[PDB]
Amino acid sequence: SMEQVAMELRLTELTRLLRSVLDQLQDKDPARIFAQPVSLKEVPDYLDHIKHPMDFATMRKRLEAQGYKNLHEFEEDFDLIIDNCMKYNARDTVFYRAAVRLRDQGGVVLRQARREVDSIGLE
Ligand SMILES: Cc1cc(NC(=O)C2CC2)on1
Ligand code: NA
């Protein structure tokens, strides 16, 4: 149907916006601490601590499959990256501190992203 095509166009446009958002958020992780899944070779007990691992590569996979239907779903995964890190790692670590900085700098990007999604009507 034409209606189905219209919704699919909206999803494609949301995906384009979120790709730009994801690139901007990842730029706020210059150490690439969140670029890939936490290594279970490096951290064998990780899944005993963290029930829903997340990282930028995993987000990008979902994104290019158009697996984010709205901004909320995308933000949920971004928040997992930060929240998982701040639980597993202590306050005085480069890991925890990278998450705090990503959260703070990322908030700015996401604030304007919400306006664009609403204004254009992408969800
Ligand atoms: C625990 C834990 C580890 C990480 N990140 C990394 O180790 C990437 C390679 C630098 O995030 N949380
Ligand atoms: Na902790």
Q: How far apart are CA 107 and CA 79, in angstroms?
A: 10
The residue with tokens 């210059």 is 30
The residue with tokens 């992203």 is 113
Chain center to CA of 59: 6
> b/e per residue, 47-62, with b = 16+ CB within 10 A?
eeebeebbbbeebbee
Q: Which residue out of 85, 87, 92, 97 has the highest number of ligand 1 atoms within 8 Å of its CB and is therefore the one to mutate?
A: 85
Torsion from C-alpha of 99, 60, 107, 21, nearest 10 degrees:
140
Ligand 1 surroundings by CB, under 6 angstroms = 33, 38, 43, 85, 88-89, 95
Residues 35, 29 contacting (CB under 8 angstroms): yes
**CATH code, domain carrying 106:** 1.20.920.10
> Is 30 in contact with 118 (CB distance < 8 Å)?
no
Q: What is the 38 CA–ligand 1 centroid distance (Å)?
A: 5
CA distances (Å), origin 103, targets 21, 64, 82, 100: 14, 23, 7, 5
- Resolution, given in Å to one decimal, reads 1.5
Closest ligand relative to 40 C-alpha: 1
Rounded Cα gap, residues 110 and 75, in angstroms: 8
Q: Which technique?
A: X-ray
To which residue do tokens 């499959």 refer? 65
Q: Which residues contact 68 (CB under 8 A, 6 or more apart)?
A: 14, 15, 18, 62, 74, 77
Range of the domain at 17: 1-123
Q: What percent helix, strand, coil does the chain show, rounded to 5?
A: 70, 0, 30
Phi, psi at 72, each rounded to 5°: -55, -40
